[PDB]
Structure formats: C-alpha cells, structure tokens
C-alpha cells in the first residue's frame, strides 16, 4: 500500500512513465481521470501558483507540505515532490524535510545539487543525509543534477555515478538536449532516469516513443496543465471585464456535471442515500 | 491600511462592483492585472479546487484561512470571503471565525441562514455575534439569505430588514431569477445588494447594465475563471496522454514571459 | 506502524498506563519516565494549546498540529481524542480519521456525544471511521457516556452495538466500581479503557485494582498538565510580587535537565 | 487596534517593564491574570517545548507563527517574538518573516546579528529590510546583539548606534553582567534597553529595582515558568509510573475549578 511502492509499481507498468504536474488537488484528480499513474508537485508551481511568487526561494517547506497533504488526502496516485535543495543548509533540515514530506503523503522526492551548483562531494553528503532520514525504504530518493547548465556532459555523468553510489534511487538530469544523453546517464547510473520535458526549457519536446528509445524511465511534464490553466483563466477575466458578462466565455468552461464528476460528487451523495 | 475600507471604497467607485473569484494567489494577481477592484474566495472553490472535494461541508475553516493568507499576502485587492454559517454554532464560534478570517487578511465576509434555513431569530444572533467580534468597523459583514426561495417574498423581506437591523452591512439574496427581486430587496433592506452571477445555475447571465437597472451594487462571478482553468488543464492532460507529447497544446499555454510578469518575477 | 506499536504496548503491559502529554516536550518526559503509550487530550488541546474551554471551540487543525509536533519527535504510540469526528456527516468523520492517522497517531477514540446521539447514529459514526481507516492496526476506540446519561442497560446495549460496528476497544465513562468494569469487559469482549482523571466523580484506582477489574488500559489525560500549570503560576506570581525569580529557582528544571530531555548534546 | 501601540504603552507605564515568556496560550492567560502587561514567545521555547527539539535552528517560521496565533488569538497582552535572524537569508525572506509575524498577531519582535556574528553592515541591512516590511509604524523592531562578548565594547557600542540609525526601535544587548554596563549601553543607544534575566546563565538575577537603577527599560524572563512546569510534569510522570497511581501528587496539581477559572470557562458556557 506504501505510496513509495505505488510509485515504483507505476514505473514497472509504464515505460516511460508519464508523470504530470498537478497544481492542486482538483487537477490531481483530473490527471487520475485522464489515466496517469503518477503525479508531480512542482516547487516553482507552489511558489508561482499557490503563493503567486517567483521561484526565488521565497516559499517555505510548510507551503509545500500543505499542497502535498491536500493533493494526497484525496488522490491516491503516487506523488513525486520537488524538494528543491532540502529547505535548510543544516543536515538536520534536509532530514526533517525528507521525513516531513514523506509523512505528508509523498511517494517520492528529488533533491538537487544547486547552491551555480555545489561540488560532487557536497551533493553526495546531501543525498546521504536524505537516504539516512528516510524511514520507509520504498520511499524514493531521486537525485537531480543541474550540471548541464554550467558543465559538460562528461562532468555531469561523473556526478551521476557519485550520486547513485551515494544512495540515490533514481536520476533527474536537468536540461538534457540530446536523446543520446539520456541513454548515457542510464548506462552509467544503472538506475531509472527521468526526463524533464517542460516547455520553454532547453530540452526539446521529445515524445514518449523517442524517450523510450533512449531508455528513459520517466517523462515529466511539471507545469503543462498549470500553463493552460492560467491562459484560460486570464481570458475569462479579460472578456468578463470588457463585456460586463461572461456569456462569450461560457463555451470554454467546464460544466457543472464535469466538475461534479471530477470530484466524485455523486459518489458522496450515494453514501448519504445508503443512510 | 484597512482592506475593509478598500472594499467599501471599491463599491463606491464602481457600480455595480464586479467581484471575481480567485481560486489561488496567482489568479488573484491575474484578476488584478485585468483591472478588477475586488476579489472573492468561494467556499465551494476551496473545497473543489484546493481540496478536490464536493461542496458538502467537508472543508474546514483552516482550509479557508490558508487560502486567504496566500492570496492577501501577495495581492492587495480587497477580498470578500465565503464563511458559511461560521463553521461553528455558538456565538463564540462565529466570533472566532470572523476574527480569524479578518486576521487572515480578508476585507469582508458573508454568513448565511442556510442550516432548510435557520429561523430569523438565530440568524439575527449570528449577525450580532459577527458584528460584535468585528475589530475594524470598516470590515464588512455581509448576510446571505435563501428565505425567498424557502418561505416566500413576504418572509424574505422581513428577514432582510431584521438582518440589517442586526447590523449586516450588505445583503446577498440567493437564487434570484427576476431582476425585480433585487429591486425589492434594495428598497426594503436599503443596503448594498449583491447579485451572484454564477454559471449553470437558475439565475440568468445578467449583464452589468441589467444589474445596474435593478439597483445591484455588486456583481459576483464566484467560479468563472476556475471553470475555464479546469477545462484547459483537462485538455492538456488528455492530449498529452493520447499523443505522448504536449506539442499540440503549446498554443493554449501561458508563456514564460507572461507568467513571470503576472508574478513580477523581474521586479524581484 | 503506530497502530502496531500501540497494540504491542497493550499486549506487553496490563493494564497499559497511557499518560497525556500536552506537547512534544512532555511526550519525551513521559517516554523517559518509562511509559509505553501516550495520549493527546482534546480538553488539553483546547485549554493548553488554545487557552479555551473544552466547549467545541478547538478544531481538527489544532489537534493535527499537536499530533505532528509530538509524533515527529516521540515514537511512542499516540492515542488521540477525536471528539465526535469534528463534523456531523460520515464525510467529516472519514476526513478526520484519515488526517489523524496521517499526522502520526496510533489510535483515536470517537464518542456518542451530541446528551448523546442514538445508538444507531453512533453505529454509523463508528462504521464511517472503520471504513475510512486504511491500516487495520490503527485503533478505533468508542467512548460513551451512556452509563451516566441513560443507565446501565443502555450503556451495555450500546457497548455491544459499538463493537459489532467495528470499534476495536471501549472507553465507558462514569464507572465507579471495579466490579462494573468487569461487567463491561465481559459484555463488550474488547479491551476496556478506564479514565483515571483527577477531580471528577471517579476514584483514583491503582493499576493493581484495575487489573482485578479486567481493565486493559488506565488513562491519565491531564495529570502532568495540571501540575505544570500550578508550577508555572507559582513562578509568575512570585516573580510579579518580588520583582525577581530568585525564590522559585529551586522548583525549576535546570538547563542541564532540559538539554538532557531534548537530547541537546546528541545534536550538538 | 494596534498590538504595537499596546506594547509601547506598557513600556511607558511600567519601568522596567517585566516581560515574561509564555510557552503557550494557557500560560499567556496565567501571566495576564498574574498582572503582567507584556509577554514573550521564546524561540528556544518553541523548539524545546512545542517541538521537543534543541534550539539549534531546527524549528521553522511556521512553528513560530502557529504559537503566535494561538497565544494572541485568546490573550490581548502585547507579545514580543523571538525571530532569530529572519528565517532565511535574503531581504525578501526577512520581509516575508516580519510581515507574517505581525500578521499572525505579534506586537514586536527582535532579530540578532548572529550568522560569530555578521558584519555591522550585514545587520544594518537586515534591520532596514525589517523596518521597510513593517506595515504598522507602531509594530516594534528590536535588535539583539552579542557583539560585546564577540568583538568587545568599542565594536558593540558602535554597532548599537548603527543599529539604531538603521531603524531599530529598541536594543537587546547580550552578555551584560553589570548595571553600569547597561547604563552605558542605554546612554549610547538612546533607545529602550532590554535585559535578559534568564536563569542558569552568566547574567545575575537582577531585581526590577536594580534594573531601574541601570536605566533598563525591559526585564525579560524567557523560560522561567516553562522550567517550573517541566519539573512539575516530570514529578507527576515519575511518581505515577513508580506507584501505579497519582494519589501522592494530587497535592501539586492545579484543580479542575482552577483550570476552568483561568480560561473563563463559565463566561463561554454563558454564551453557549
């Protein structure tokens, strides 16, 4: 039943496993109804969406925990969580963070080597503090590297090896621009590799068939839905403010039955009927 | 500063005052950029959006307070909050609720007589307890009622005046299909009336001009933006799952520059 | 799992002494004193954490925060006072049960308070609670004040119905004879908890006495909390009257004792 | 409608003003009933009491905000809060922290030059960041410093003036063991001075009369009640576990009537 076991189970059943970001509980339920087997909580999303703040280390662990509980309290899909760099320079912080996130209901989390990026040894220690704090061995500790933004592939691969040896269960190579690169991290790391297919990034919009050819274990789409959600919302605000009526925007609105079906409204009423 | 004043001022410079719901802090900033002068925190939205639950009284005051702080901590627009029956029951419950919501950063809130509905008497105490707990007199205490559709016009208007005599600063009649109804409340209650122009309900999609002729002081669009964001999010999930790529939905996605600007990324 | 730890403590101690801990610190003091299980008093969350009377003012969120604080640092299984489920519908009870378990609790008790609800209503609450539980080892205890409110027959009839409904253990109030506890144990056929709180109508039974009565758990809900309030008050009064705390230094836990209790040096 | 004003008024009314720590809402009420005009939320107390953790930077702002709301939601006494260094490291972090603490209900807070201590310039920027985030000019921003011990008197007095010029409404200087030294700091800073009269420390247990003679504006007792409550609780746990009954500690327990009275039980039941 362990959410961590659920995540790993998802991986074994889907390759590459599509993991979509869910900005809130409602969207996690939509993703589930769409067929997805796992979801994601973006840190930049918590900041930009939940707090309306830029992703400049302004949001706190508590902001993230709150969204983790909301999402997992109602959606059973294993949730991968963006734990940034650990929320705290102290090892105690990295540890309290890992335990808090797991306790909030997350199935997995990824911690990065950013400060520019810290040294291999540094990250290796962070990873160790994380693996140590974990209680449920099935809970996934993913190690993310942003080395490709400031270093070369070879250097990034060197880290990838040290991060795995450090205990990292899976690898998250950021900003990969070539399909062949994914293959090299896989062959070198020997653990599941996640491809971050976020739009407006350096990484091309690879298809799942392309990622599969590169042995990619996971395809992540962190803010996709959020992005379309914002545009549609903005449209409603503009049209409504210009015409003094939302009449010409009704057509792009989820209906009552659709909303109700996504949140299992009828099922709740059913239980009441039974009484 | 007093958001209660900002709210009162807003109704003064805009008639009817358009108040749009904002499901989260981000959308509050969007509504602000769109030019709105006041926003709303829908209770059904906190449940459906923040919790992914139906509007069956499962959400808690704390769930609501979290969204209030998030929104009001970054957006200065006056926020009207849906506080239901006070989530408690006794006088001290309504007070703690009103105080908490005010402390959280809201500018106004509305409580309702919907338990069937409570007797005129208990609603009167409800309003009194609410008004008494108020610290800043500029904080708005709105009363929402459904007596019209339950007891009838005569009874509805009776409650209306009572609710006003109890101290309610504004009235929120629910499920109004005829504009005449709004006028009767405005003439009887003689306090700013709010029209809930939500979609897929029993109320027609009245325009701002139509509401003005009915003497409506506020036009409410509780979930409008929310409904559109869900359809858009659903479209993205569906296409991505079918096609294995989001290439064909990029066109309906807010761009990086657009996002960064809505949250003043460059300013930081 | 916490539920397993609770049942493990129960299987190894008879009766199992369960002491209330008002906060994380005291949870550690209890652990150091040798207790195998601790308690989170609902009245303690209200009076201690909120400074309010136990009259339905505290919320589920207040309780959850204390559960996380305590269980994040103390591994002793924690029994939680979930009042009536913090809501009327089975939906509320369901959300409450999952949240409390998620926060780290090992068990919780729910009561038939409204006077009390009908046997049928409580049966539904219990079923809703049992249905919401995911880990069968998580304990769902039924608390009932039927003996005092309705009488022996009513209490025993309800006790049986509550067990059939899925309640793992029973918390019957107002019993004043060890012989009556045996009767409840024989009829319910599930572990019985005896509330040994102070200043009430019930006797301060010893663990040996409770054992002779077939009582499985002995509860001391606010015992430590009571002694802590008196000591704190003594400090405040002397300090105020004398302009220094010199004369109350002798009743203070030392810095070394504090450090020892929270494993300061270990972290250092 | 300003806890900041209430704090300043308490200062003017009582000199030195006794500020006692309250580990939770209940004790805030006990302090209020004992007659105190201001209370304190110790950072060390939030960690050791609310979290059962050492005061080594493990607690978060959220843990503090929760206790602030709980306390100020029921007790009207102005509350001074220990905000450490602003929980974070950026000007945006100090600002968000200052704002949230005030929004949570506090009347004042203090930040320190702790990193060794940061440079005078570093601290000056923190203070300025806090003062600018402040929405109510009455909300008090206190600067805590341990420069006397770390860098010596010349440097400490220098930072003090610099901190005040930066906007600190009050000063909280550590490591002072002599009245004459408090006197000197007060003369230089020209703002209200707080003396930390915590126990089991280097500082003597100065009396209010002695502190008044030292130009000290506030007397702080950060964990006094907390210390006594822990010992009492430990006593109950121990005796109870050892004897299988709490009969022999009933004598040191606050009764139910006393508890009810301290939290105005009957005034609420009157409303119910």
PDB file of N, CA and C in Angstrom, chain B residues 3 9 39 75 104 124 151 205-206 226:
ATOM      1  N   UNK B   3      -8.337  46.781   4.587  1.00  0.00           N
ATOM      2  CA  UNK B   3      -8.962  46.181   3.406  1.00  0.00           C
ATOM      3  C   UNK B   3     -10.469  46.393   3.446  1.00  0.00           C
ATOM      4  N   UNK B   9     -14.643  51.336  -0.434  1.00  0.00           N
ATOM      5  CA  UNK B   9     -14.298  52.333  -1.439  1.00  0.00           C
ATOM      6  C   UNK B   9     -14.587  51.781  -2.837  1.00  0.00           C
ATOM      7  N   UNK B  39     -11.916  41.048  -5.154  1.00  0.00           N
ATOM      8  CA  UNK B  39     -11.928  39.628  -5.481  1.00  0.00           C
ATOM      9  C   UNK B  39     -12.717  38.818  -4.461  1.00  0.00           C
ATOM     10  N   UNK B  75      -1.530  39.789  -2.912  1.00  0.00           N
ATOM     11  CA  UNK B  75      -2.458  40.643  -3.647  1.00  0.00           C
ATOM     12  C   UNK B  75      -3.182  41.603  -2.703  1.00  0.00           C
ATOM     13  N   UNK B 104      -6.663  36.892   9.071  1.00  0.00           N
ATOM     14  CA  UNK B 104      -6.057  36.256   7.909  1.00  0.00           C
ATOM     15  C   UNK B 104      -5.802  37.260   6.779  1.00  0.00           C
ATOM     16  N   UNK B 124     -30.277  36.419  13.392  1.00  0.00           N
ATOM     17  CA  UNK B 124     -30.077  37.738  13.976  1.00  0.00           C
ATOM     18  C   UNK B 124     -28.947  37.684  15.004  1.00  0.00           C
ATOM     19  N   UNK B 151     -39.314  30.467   2.197  1.00  0.00           N
ATOM     20  CA  UNK B 151     -40.509  30.933   2.886  1.00  0.00           C
ATOM     21  C   UNK B 151     -41.407  31.832   2.041  1.00  0.00           C
ATOM     22  N   UNK B 205     -27.737  34.939 -16.991  1.00  0.00           N
ATOM     23  CA  UNK B 205     -26.453  35.619 -17.100  1.00  0.00           C
ATOM     24  C   UNK B 205     -26.664  37.117 -17.296  1.00  0.00           C
ATOM     25  N   UNK B 206     -27.126  37.778 -16.238  1.00  0.00           N
ATOM     26  CA  UNK B 206     -27.379  39.215 -16.270  1.00  0.00           C
ATOM     27  C   UNK B 206     -26.104  40.007 -16.538  1.00  0.00           C
ATOM     28  N   UNK B 226     -12.191  29.673 -12.646  1.00  0.00           N
ATOM     29  CA  UNK B 226     -11.917  28.304 -12.209  1.00  0.00           C
ATOM     30  C   UNK B 226     -12.407  27.277 -13.228  1.00  0.00           C
TER      31      UNK B 226
END
